[PDB]
Amino acid sequence: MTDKIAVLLGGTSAEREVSLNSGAAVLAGLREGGIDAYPVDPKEVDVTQLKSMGFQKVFIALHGRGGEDGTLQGMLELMGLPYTGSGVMASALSMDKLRSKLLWQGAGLPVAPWVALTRAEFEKGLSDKQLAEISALGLPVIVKPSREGSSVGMSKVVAENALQDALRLAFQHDEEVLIEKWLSGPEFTVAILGEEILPSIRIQPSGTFYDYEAKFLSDETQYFCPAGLEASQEANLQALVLKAWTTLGCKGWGRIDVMLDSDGQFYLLEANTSPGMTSHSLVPMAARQAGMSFSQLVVRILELAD
Ligand SMILES: Nc1ncnc2c1ncn2[C@@H]1O[C@H](COP(=O)(O)OP(=O)(O)O)[C@@H](O)[C@H]1O
Ligand SMILES: C[C@@H](C[P@@](=O)(OP(=O)(O)O)[C@@H](C)N)C(=O)O
Numbered sequence: 001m002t003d004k005i006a007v008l009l010g011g012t013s014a015e016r017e018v019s020l021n022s023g024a025a026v027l028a029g030l031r032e033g034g035i036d037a038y039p040v041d042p043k044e045v046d047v048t049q050l051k052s053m054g055f056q057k058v059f060i061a062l063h064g065r066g067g068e069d070g071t072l073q074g075m076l077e078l079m080g081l082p083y084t085g086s087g088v089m090a091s092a093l094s095m096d097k098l099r100s101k102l103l104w105q106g107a108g109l110p111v112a113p114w115v116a117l118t119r120a121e122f123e124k125g126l127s128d129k130q131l132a133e134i135s136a137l138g139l140p141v142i143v144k145p146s147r148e149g150s151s152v153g154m155s156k157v158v159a160e161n162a163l164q165d166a167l168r169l170a171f172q173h174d175e176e177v178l179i180e181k182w183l184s185g186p187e188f189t190v191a192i193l194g195e196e197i198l199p200s201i202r203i204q205p206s207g208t209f210y211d212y213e214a215k216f217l218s219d220e221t222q223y224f225c226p227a228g229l230e231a232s233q234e235a236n237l238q239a240l241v242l243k244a245w246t247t248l249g250c251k252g253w254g255r256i257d258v259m260l261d262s263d264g265q266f267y268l269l270e271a272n273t274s275p276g277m278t279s280h281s282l283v284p285m286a287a288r289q290a291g292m293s294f295s296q297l298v299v300r301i302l303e304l305a306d
């Protein structure tokens with residue numbers, strides 16, 4: 001019987017394997033909840049044919065450029081297919097950490113001190129005063145590609161001596177890079193589903209930072225849901241995250257990453273518009289604590305599609 005939902009997974013970004021795992025999860029969750037869901041991989045299928053195929057809605061489970069940057073949402077807007085998550089502007093804006101930062105800081109929101117570099121400036125040689133602005137950040141510092149996820153392309157540099165290799169790795173993934181002040185932690189994440197914010201999660205990695213391996217591969221990562229903060233701080237977290245969410249213009253569902261620093265204040269890291277839904281993912285963890293089943297959450301996200 002009529003009513004086909006397309007579940008977009010895989011893709012070609014550096015987050016492809018993670019996305020196939022998020023898709024597998026969502027496909028079962030949706031079917032368990034009575035939905036006639038179909039797995040569609042844009043690397044295999046021409047998604048520009050989604051409408052000619054009979055699909056009524058699209059559940060986006062892609063991660064990274066191509067699925068979270070607004071291009072895919074742009075097409076679906078012209079094709080007329082309701083879809084999950086944020087619109088074109090919010091998605092394009094959330095993917096770019098340098099631009100989410102300008103926006104956030106411009107709105108008065110807490111963002112860690114940073115320096116942006118383009119591959120060109122890097123190739124030409126860092127005009128030494130470049131280093132003067134980077135050393136003013138203090139050490140250590142964190143280097144990250146502007147448009148990535150899953151800790152791809154990042155690294156920590158203790159002392160200016162290590163900066164070159166770090167920048168060379170980051171520029172392999174993007175032409176625009178950020179170098180930001182290293183925050184002490186702990187680290188937090190806060191998921192949003194519609195007009196509601198789920199209970200906070202505090203992440204605790206075994207190594208240097210929450211890397212690729214700590215996110216999807218090791219059983220050493222600890223999580224605490226709720227965070228364990230006093231109501232006063234738990235309150236401050238939601239207020240911040242909600243303002244971060246609305247300034248960006250996001251909607252549907254998402255997850256914002258935050259961290260504490262030595263001055264006892266919260267700092268925005270980034271916002272993700274199409275979060276992971278694998279067995280190691282944070283969003284499913286928060287919903288569980290909020291009393292929902294994996295099926296319920298997924299079914300709810302699709303309910304929010306527009
Ligand atoms: N300024 C920072 N200071 C300390 N750790 C950071 C900082 N920025 C990022 N991290 C760490 O790096 C991880 C990944 O960075 P994030 O900005 O959230 O990008 P991604 O989209 O790859 O997740 C974070 O979860 C955290 O563990
Ligand atoms: C660990 C996290 C990953 P992810 O949602 O977010 P990050 O950008 O922080 O990795 C990612 C897919 N883009 C999760 O699946 O919940």
Ligand SMILES: [Mg+2]
Pocket residue numbers: 148149150270271272
């Ligand atoms: Mg991210």
Ligand SMILES: [Mg+2]
Pocket residue numbers: 150257269270
């Ligand atoms: Mg993150």
